[PDB]
């Protein structure tokens, strides 16, 4: 899962 938001996807 790439891109912006990637980090806090959940």
């Amino acid at each position, epitope marked *: 899962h*790439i*891109g*912006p*938001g*990637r*980090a*806090f996807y*959940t």
Partner: antibody
Amino acid sequence: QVKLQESGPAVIKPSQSLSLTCIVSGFSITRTNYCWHWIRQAPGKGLEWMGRICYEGSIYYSPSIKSRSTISRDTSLNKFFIQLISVTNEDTAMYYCSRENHMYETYFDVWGQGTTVTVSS
Amino acid sequence: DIVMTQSPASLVVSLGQRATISCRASESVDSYGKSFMHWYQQKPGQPPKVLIYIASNLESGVPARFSGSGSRTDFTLTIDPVEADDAATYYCQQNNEDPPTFGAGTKLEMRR
């Protein structure tokens, strides 16, 4: 408006714990979308990424630091930290904390001055 | 993960001229049809300054003479006309997937 100030020890004996603190000021650690990073640049070398801690607590570490590192925050003081265990001369560097809009922008828009750290006896 | 390869490692360009720094990424740094790589400038003992984000977009304040181009794996910062101030190192960074990564830097020193 926003300020970030790194603080830490100028010098530290080899094989001891480096612990830096990044102090966001005039903006909160927890406003959504921002993730807060640590970047270090060993003298005469490139920037190298160390890890981030996103506004809601997700942490992520560069492999190389992963197993000798601990990124924690302090929501009430509005500061975050990093611990580097068993430092060596390759830890001697300039350490920076910066800010990222992780939802709309992807790039490091504010950066503290950076403190310097010399690992030496 | 992506390894970012800047080239040249250093270069000497004379005032009024054009410099062309290039940064190549081992894999695509694209998503939502945007290229999520950015260029930074670091005058000595200054934190990096953003110059250009998301491959083409100019940051406020950065002058006309900075041009962000490219996509997927091929990206070009172009400064023309070069002048005084641009004596600095320039880095490109991707931040499309973990961990984010930086180029090795290109030092611009310049001729008078």
